[PDB]
Amino acid sequence: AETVSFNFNSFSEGNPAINFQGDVTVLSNGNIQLTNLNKVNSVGRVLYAMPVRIWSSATGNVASFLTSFSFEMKDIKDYDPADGIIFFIAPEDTQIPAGSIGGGTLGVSDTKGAGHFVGVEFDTYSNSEYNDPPTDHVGIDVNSVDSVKTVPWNSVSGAVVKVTVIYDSSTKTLSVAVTNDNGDITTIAQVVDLKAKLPERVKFGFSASGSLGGRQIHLIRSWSFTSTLITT
Amino acid sequence: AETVSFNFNSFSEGNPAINFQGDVTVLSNGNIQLTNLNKVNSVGRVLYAMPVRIWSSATGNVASFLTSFSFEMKDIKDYDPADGIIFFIAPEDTQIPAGSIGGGTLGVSDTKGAGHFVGVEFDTYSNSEYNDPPTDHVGIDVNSVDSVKTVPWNSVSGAVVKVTVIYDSSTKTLSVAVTNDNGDITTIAQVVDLKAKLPERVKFGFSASGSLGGRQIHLIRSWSFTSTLITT
Amino acid sequence: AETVSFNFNSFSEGNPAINFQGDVTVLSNGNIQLTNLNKVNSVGRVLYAMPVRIWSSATGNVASFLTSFSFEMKDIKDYDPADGIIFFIAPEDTQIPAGSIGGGTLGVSDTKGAGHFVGVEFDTYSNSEYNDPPTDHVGIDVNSVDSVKTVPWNSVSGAVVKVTVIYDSSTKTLSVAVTNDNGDITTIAQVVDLKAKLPERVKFGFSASGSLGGRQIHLIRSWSFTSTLITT
Amino acid sequence: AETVSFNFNSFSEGNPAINFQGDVTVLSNGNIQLTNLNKVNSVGRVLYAMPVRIWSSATGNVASFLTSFSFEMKDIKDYDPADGIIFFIAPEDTQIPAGSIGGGTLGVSDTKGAGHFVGVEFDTYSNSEYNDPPTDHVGIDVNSVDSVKTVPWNSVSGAVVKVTVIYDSSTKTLSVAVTNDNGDITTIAQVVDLKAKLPERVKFGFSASGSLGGRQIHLIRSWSFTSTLITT
Numbered sequence A, B, C, D: 001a002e003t004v005s006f007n008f009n010s011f012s013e014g015n016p017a018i019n020f021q022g023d024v025t026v027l028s029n030g031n032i033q034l035t036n037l038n039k040v041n042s043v044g045r046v047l048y049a050m051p052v053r054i055w056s057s058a059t060g061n062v063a064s065f066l067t068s069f070s071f072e073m074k075d076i077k078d079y080d081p082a083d084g085i086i087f088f089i090a091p092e093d094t095q096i097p098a099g100s101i102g103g104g105t106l107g108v109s110d111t112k113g114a115g116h117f118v119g120v121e122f123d124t125y126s127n128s129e130y131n132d133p134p135t136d137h138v139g140i141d142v143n144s145v146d147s148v149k150t151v152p153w154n155s156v157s158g159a160v161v162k163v164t165v166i167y168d169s170s171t172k173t174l175s176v177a178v179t180n181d182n183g184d185i186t187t188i189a190q191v192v193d194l195k196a197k198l199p200e201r202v203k204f205g206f207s208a209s210g211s212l213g214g215r216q217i218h219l220i221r222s223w224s225f226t227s228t229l230i231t232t
């Protein structure tokens, strides 16, 4: 079968395996910082350089993937914790959205909240403008920052989070599982025909954003991904 | 929230956290061997000692869980590789099924293939008697060794397999992801109202079985489980 | 550490992980055929799409890699068996050399035999023009098809060959091991400062070529590569 | 040519192809356990029964060999992980060294650390007594447990390791490549005139050792070897 599999326990600029779009800054400790704290409307994304072919117009098949990653969002004195991180899939040609300001497009949509991508969001700030549930949540976005489905979650400053994602090729089920510091697990799941929303070749990555009054650190500590596309 | 979480990177008899039913033998290397190679109809199960309350007749809620484990099945000269391992959930009072012989009840059902449990099987031998697909497969059993759903898989002797399982409380979606030695991933998913098939208190574990002509080693190398039941 | 690792047990056009330059044709059986039999001066290469950073101008370090692959070269009635296959490393910008004719540039050099690359060759036809030893050989090329070192080898039509390559980061030692059909092993080794001949970002692949009178099938059946670059 | 080639994916006592010296115990799962956990100064070796003639006093030639193997070292509650495994070559008459105690002779040398053999070690415990680098390492021993060369490595409990070794007949270059669980590869290489340190007929095998305070399980899961001696 056709399989893609990489693994990052640390990061460093110059690695041809990763493309940095935006205010992404790599720390001297192999950690990725997605947003710039001294900017209004900061926006940053990190992408796996090579396009992965998720489905075949020939086979009709759609790949399954098992990806897990860890992150951390520490608060900063006199600032609203926002906007949150986001793990997403987009067309190989994906450009980084327009930086916006009070806004919270998580770096994947326009001022309105539209965009061509599919992703899991770890949102920590409500925006009446995009239907943001009253509090912190994990969502499943499909071409819109107005999550298709959402589940109550709670973000804890300085806490390392572990996230395991599974996608079933057949059942077209995207299933997330958020492991918190204390132990408790948060989970959400949703059907998303990857073959219906995304072109054959897409790209995987993490994106973030901030506002004029909303800022915080967004750290991607590690990432491991594996996808297999049956073809025969 | 109410959360259960344990982790085994090795095993050893005498640990009050685990109950051994059957031909289960713990190796001098912290590995669990489920079946006896010198017996006809061997049968062995390993269970997590404490019952876990998966759902509340009060809350109406159902717990989500994230469990991952690793195993190995090595062949033995002049023998049919069978019957395979099985990760399952049963009523807290679960007794070990009647050993059977040519059979392949995987240690959780009667000669007919019936039984009260829900599990994911890693079957390596077809039995016209239970609708076993032509070849090796991973299935989703619900009170029957005649899998509700199955997906083509391939068992490799002496290979360590990693398995990550996720259950969503709401969507009632059981999602498995099998990682093979070469890298490729196999995934299957199914809806199973845990609150519909199982009593409030159940038990988690791994079971196995062998036949007169079918035998092999069944090793459970490691296991980590975590469930969280929202109650409020 | 920074590690790259992929694995191909079969191939298929359209996979974004591989670039096809030349007369490369993918068979309906997941096998790569490097040259066109009905052409004079056929030339074909297959490359791993992403550039791998072999050394760091910052760390001063150079990655080690373990790559193994298998191939087959079947003869064709009324034709001289040539030119042979070649596993090579080149600057990320590598274009496919000019097709040549009686020649045997193995698809990586000019008419003269010069070129910017480093590779292991599995040559099956002698050319007084490039110092080709009297018979079939395995060589170690460094910017020239006139091998730096060579060892007697014997190519057998329709035989599948297994090749394991190891490169030591420190000792700068490139070590090959050719396993033939009958069992016997052929081995060659050579020091090559990868950091001295190649730019930071290079590409890995297999190349081939044919002549007016020299032609044969060149099949790359499988390929597995892994490189690790220590950085800290 | 003169070629030796065997392959073990499992083991079992009684096989005339293998000699067991020491506390070697074969598990009911085709796995070899090198040391006894309940002994002070345990020592165990496993050898390929037949002597292999590495070089000819006639030809002047030296054989090349390609051997790869896999092992596992799991820790045990309240014990220092030691001493490690070792793949070695010795004179056909090789007796198993004197068991020692606090010591870490890896079962191939005297209390002083001397001995007649050549091997690659996978050491997991430092001994000021033999120049052991601060931490876990892979070394190249030549008649002394005080490695000629060493490279930083990291041993992970319960992890299966794959090791590919290549020896070039001419360049007299012994090249190792350690593949860890996460993917990363560790490599080391050294020149060792086999014809200079060893007699014509030698034996290949794996050895281990433990101490009063240092103990752990040492498992040899598989082994495949092939050597070819050119003679003409």
Ligand SMILES: [O-]S(O)(O)c1ccc(-c2c3nc(c(-c4ccc(S([O-])(O)O)cc4)c4ccc([nH]4)c(-c4ccc(S([O-])(O)O)cc4)c4nc(c(-c5ccc(S([O-])(O)O)cc5)c5ccc2[nH]5)C=C4)C=C3)cc1
Pocket: A027, A028, A029
């Ligand atoms: O514009 S301003 O003037 O306003 C201005 C704005 C911001 C900054 C800060 C800053 N760090 C702070 C804390 C902090 C402060 C106060 C409290 S408080 O007391 O509670 O208030 C709490 C926490 C803080 C805590 C821990 C760290 N910073 C660690 C760190 C963590 C973990 C490890 S580890 O590995 O050991 O785990 C190692 C290191 C690092 N910090 C850097 C780093 C850097 C250097 C070079 C390079 S580069 O050149 O690129 O290589 C890249 C990155 C910078 C550059 C600027 C900078 N840090 C690298 C590691 C607070 C402010 C300075 C001035």
Ligand SMILES: [O-]S(O)(O)c1ccc(-c2c3nc(c(-c4ccc(S([O-])(O)O)cc4)c4ccc([nH]4)c(-c4ccc(S([O-])(O)O)cc4)c4nc(c(-c5ccc(S([O-])(O)O)cc5)c5ccc2[nH]5)C=C4)C=C3)cc1
Pocket: A025, A027, A029, A031, A033, A037, A038, A072, A074, A075, A076, A077, A217, A219
């Ligand atoms: O404009 S203003 O004047 O308003 C203004 C706005 C923002 C800032 C701050 C700031 N950090 C703070 C904390 C903080 C302090 C006290 C508490 S409190 O005690 O709770 O109150 C809570 C939080 C804080 C805590 C931890 C960190 N900061 C860490 C850090 C990361 C990762 C790790 S670790 O261990 O995970 O690796 C460890 C530590 C980093 N911070 C940077 C960094 C940076 C430097 C250079 C570059 S570059 O361009 O690349 O050179 C890019 C990025 C900046 C730039 C500005 C900045 N940090 C890099 C790492 C508080 C304020 C200062 C002034």
Ligand SMILES: [O-]S(O)(O)c1ccc(-c2c3nc(c(-c4ccc(S([O-])(O)O)cc4)c4ccc([nH]4)c(-c4ccc(S([O-])(O)O)cc4)c4nc(c(-c5ccc(S([O-])(O)O)cc5)c5ccc2[nH]5)C=C4)C=C3)cc1
Pocket: A040, A041, A099, A100, A101, A212, A213
């Ligand atoms: O499109 S978006 O919607 O995304 C969007 C994008 C960008 C912006 C902002 C912005 N500034 C903000 C503050 C701000 C306000 C309130 C708070 S808060 O209230 O605390 O929250 C915090 C921060 C803010 C505070 C101070 C300044 N801005 C100062 C400044 C600094 C120093 C001095 S000085 O001299 O006194 O030192 C004087 C003035 C300047 N700002 C510019 C400037 C500019 C002008 C002309 C030209 S040009 O045409 O080239 O000439 C080039 C550049 C722009 C252009 C855009 C822009 N500033 C020039 C000086 C907040 C947002 C808004 C929306």
Ligand SMILES: [O-]S(O)(O)c1ccc(-c2c3nc(c(-c4ccc(S([O-])(O)O)cc4)c4ccc([nH]4)c(-c4ccc(S([O-])(O)O)cc4)c4nc(c(-c5ccc(S([O-])(O)O)cc5)c5ccc2[nH]5)C=C4)C=C3)cc1
Pocket: B056, B057, B058, B059, B200
């Ligand atoms: O309006 S008022 O304000 O007056 C008002 C009065 C009462 C309530 C409470 C309440 N339960 C409390 C405890 C409690 C918590 C902490 C302490 S503490 O010790 O002080 O801290 C002490 C006591 C508490 C503890 C255990 C239970 N409740 C269990 C239970 C028993 C057994 C098991 S098990 O697993 O063992 O079998 C599992 C769960 C149940 N509770 C219900 C239940 C119910 C739901 C739906 C249906 S139906 O519609 O039919 O579906 C039928 C019944 C209700 C409905 C209302 C209600 N419980 C069903 C099971 C405390 C308050 C709220 C508001």
Ligand SMILES: [O-]S(O)(O)c1ccc(-c2c3nc(c(-c4ccc(S([O-])(O)O)cc4)c4ccc([nH]4)c(-c4ccc(S([O-])(O)O)cc4)c4nc(c(-c5ccc(S([O-])(O)O)cc5)c5ccc2[nH]5)C=C4)C=C3)cc1
Pocket: B056, B057, B058, B059, B230, B231, B232
């Ligand atoms: O009139 S007002 O508007 O003012 C008003 C009056 C009453 C209420 C409360 C209330 N519960 C409280 C506690 C509480 C919290 C902290 C402490 S403290 O720690 O002491 O502070 C003490 C007590 C509390 C603790 C535990 C429970 N409640 C549990 C419960 C039991 C068992 C389990 S489990 O899982 O363990 O089995 C899990 C959960 C349940 N509670 C319900 C339940 C219910 C839901 C649906 C249906 S229906 O759909 O109709 O069937 C029927 C019944 C209601 C409905 C109203 C209501 N509970 C069902 C289960 C405190 C207030 C709110 C507003």
Ligand SMILES: [O-]S(O)(O)c1ccc(-c2c3nc(c(-c4ccc(S([O-])(O)O)cc4)c4ccc([nH]4)c(-c4ccc(S([O-])(O)O)cc4)c4nc(c(-c5ccc(S([O-])(O)O)cc5)c5ccc2[nH]5)C=C4)C=C3)cc1
Pocket: C025, C027, C029, C031, C037, C038, C072, C074, C075, C076, C077, C217, C219
């Ligand atoms: O100009 S002339 O008239 O002179 C002239 C010159 C050359 C040819 C031959 C030829 N093949 C021969 C053997 C052969 C015969 C007898 C013996 S004998 O026994 O020694 O006698 C030995 C060898 C031979 C053996 C095996 C193959 N050919 C295999 C093949 C490879 C690998 C596998 S497998 O399974 O291992 O992968 C399976 C099959 C293939 N051959 C093609 C192929 C092709 C087609 C379309 C496209 S495209 O257009 O791109 O679609 C691309 C490529 C062509 C095109 C021309 C051509 N093959 C594709 C696969 C002998 C002659 C004919 C006439």
Ligand SMILES: [O-]S(O)(O)c1ccc(-c2c3nc(c(-c4ccc(S([O-])(O)O)cc4)c4ccc([nH]4)c(-c4ccc(S([O-])(O)O)cc4)c4nc(c(-c5ccc(S([O-])(O)O)cc5)c5ccc2[nH]5)C=C4)C=C3)cc1
Pocket: C040, C041, C099, C100, C101, C212, C213
């Ligand atoms: O009508 S019929 O059906 O009867 C019929 C009549 C003639 C032909 C042939 C033909 N070439 C042959 C060999 C050949 C094969 C085997 C042997 S054998 O050894 O004897 O067996 C001997 C010879 C042969 C060998 C090498 C070449 N041909 C090379 C060549 C050399 C070197 C290089 S290089 O650069 O790589 O060095 C690259 C390419 C070229 N051939 C042309 C070319 C051409 C293209 C465009 C234009 S134009 O219109 O002006 O644009 C003008 C000319 C034509 C046009 C027709 C034609 N070639 C251009 C380059 C054998 C027959 C086919 C059918």
Ligand SMILES: [O-]S(O)(O)c1ccc(-c2c3nc(c(-c4ccc(S([O-])(O)O)cc4)c4ccc([nH]4)c(-c4ccc(S([O-])(O)O)cc4)c4nc(c(-c5ccc(S([O-])(O)O)cc5)c5ccc2[nH]5)C=C4)C=C3)cc1
Pocket: D056, D057, D058, D059
């Ligand atoms: O199966 S068959 O029946 O077919 C059959 C097959 C092969 C043989 C031969 C053979 N040697 C020949 C010449 C030869 C003869 C005549 C002329 S002519 O007159 O010129 O024509 C030319 C050449 C020949 C010349 C020189 C040597 N042989 C030298 C030698 C080289 C270099 C030096 S030195 O000092 O210079 O280094 C010293 C000695 C040696 N030969 C051996 C040796 C051996 C012994 C023990 C062990 S072991 O068991 O491992 O201990 C391993 C190997 C064997 C084993 C078989 C064998 N030699 C060891 C050294 C001709 C045939 C006989 C029968």
Ligand SMILES: [O-]S(O)(O)c1ccc(-c2c3nc(c(-c4ccc(S([O-])(O)O)cc4)c4ccc([nH]4)c(-c4ccc(S([O-])(O)O)cc4)c4nc(c(-c5ccc(S([O-])(O)O)cc5)c5ccc2[nH]5)C=C4)C=C3)cc1
Pocket: D056, D057, D058, D059, D230, D231, D232
């Ligand atoms: O059965 S068959 O009939 O088929 C048959 C086939 C082949 C043979 C021959 C043979 N050697 C010949 C000459 C020769 C003689 C005269 C002229 S002429 O007079 O010019 O015509 C031309 C050529 C010849 C000349 C020199 C040598 N042989 C030298 C040699 C090289 C270098 C030096 S040195 O030290 O000086 O450098 C010293 C000696 C050696 N030969 C061996 C050797 C061997 C031994 C053990 C081992 S092993 O198993 O590994 O131990 C491996 C190899 C064998 C085994 C068979 C064999 N040699 C080792 C060294 C002619 C025939 C006999 C029968």
Ligand SMILES: [Ca+2]
Pocket: A083, A084, A104, A123, A124, A125, A126, A127, A132
């Ligand atoms: Ca938001």
Ligand SMILES: [Ca+2]
Pocket: B083, B104, B123, B124, B125, B126, B127, B132
């Ligand atoms: Ca079965």
Ligand SMILES: [Ca+2]
Pocket: C083, C104, C123, C124, C125, C126, C127, C132
């Ligand atoms: Ca040539």
Ligand SMILES: [Ca+2]
Pocket: D083, D104, D105, D123, D124, D125, D126, D127, D132
């Ligand atoms: Ca030691």
Ligand SMILES: [Mn+2]
Pocket: A121, A123, A130, A131, A132, A133, A137, A139, A145, A146, A147
């Ligand atoms: Mn949202």
Ligand SMILES: [Mn+2]
Pocket: B121, B123, B130, B131, B132, B133, B137, B139, B145, B146, B147
């Ligand atoms: Mn079945």
Ligand SMILES: [Mn+2]
Pocket: C121, C123, C130, C131, C132, C133, C139, C145, C146, C147
């Ligand atoms: Mn050559």
